[PDB]
């Protein structure tokens, strides 16, 4: 298949060009909503934790894939291991609210607390990059607080992604990046 390379119009040659046959493909595993819909661990702070998806480590599956979207939307789920009661507060709340129990507060129940939280930002959508490095403080899902938080996991629900950005694999020093693969 020859074409004008300067154009940018996508070109997709197939094996039929030399007598082959294109097969069937099932791409459920690369569906955006599906792939981001799983828990990812984040290292927490002792007490006040602002819920911010950018805390996800950039090399993790969720962290890397989220960063390939410049704008995104999603509801949220958190699983938290904590001592004492856990209090959540919405986007825009005064930090002082974290100590008042009428704001969604989950009483301790071993071994952890799982909660479904709604998108709560004033923007129609959030971003992973903002040309204004550092993101506006309004880019968050509220905050939580407990006597001590030991584990914090995020899970994106109903995710939507806009405008793809670079996604980098590891750069090998050798001809191939070799890893020990699970084997009996």
């Amino acid at each position: 298949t020859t074409s004008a390379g300067e154009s940018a119009d996508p070109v997709t040659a197939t094996v039929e060009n030399y007598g082959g046959e294109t097969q069937v493909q099932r791409r459920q595993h690369t569906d955006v909503s599906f792939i981001l819909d799983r828990f990812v661990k984040v290292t927490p702070k002792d007490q006040i934790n602002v819920l911010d998806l950018m805390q996800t480590p950039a090399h993790t599956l969720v962290g890397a894939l989220l960063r390939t979207a410049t704008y995104y939307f999603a509801d949220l789920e958190v699983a938290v291991k904590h001592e004492g009661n856990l209090t959540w507060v919405p986007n825009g709340a005064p930090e002082t609210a974290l100590d008042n129990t009428t704001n969604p507060t989950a009483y301790h129940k071993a071994p952890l607390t799982r909660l479904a939280l709604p998108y709560t930002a004033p923007h129609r959508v959030l971003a992973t990059a903002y040309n204004g490095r550092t993101l506006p403080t309004s880019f968050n899902y509220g905050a939580i607080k407990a006597t001590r938080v030991t584990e914090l996991l995020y899970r994106m629900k109903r995710a939507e992604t806009y405008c793809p950005r670079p996604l980098l694999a590891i750069h090998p020093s050798e001809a191939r990046h070799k890893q020990k693969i699970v084997a009996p």
Partner: protein, 46 residues
């Protein structure tokens, strides 16, 4: 819609389980990929 597999209706109302979207007044990349040229630009011999 994503990684959810329960056959029973959620016990809680949708209005509580999730935030509710509002309207005003894979979309783009799916259309872009589907519009890809997939043939030969010239004449074909045998």
């Amino acid at each position: 819609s994503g990684n959810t597999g329960s056959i029973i209706n959620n016990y809680y109302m949708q209005q509580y389980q999730n935030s509710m979207d509002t309207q005003l007044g894979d979309d783009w990349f799916s259309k872009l990929a589907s519009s890809a040229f997939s043939g030969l630009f010239g004449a074909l011999l045998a």
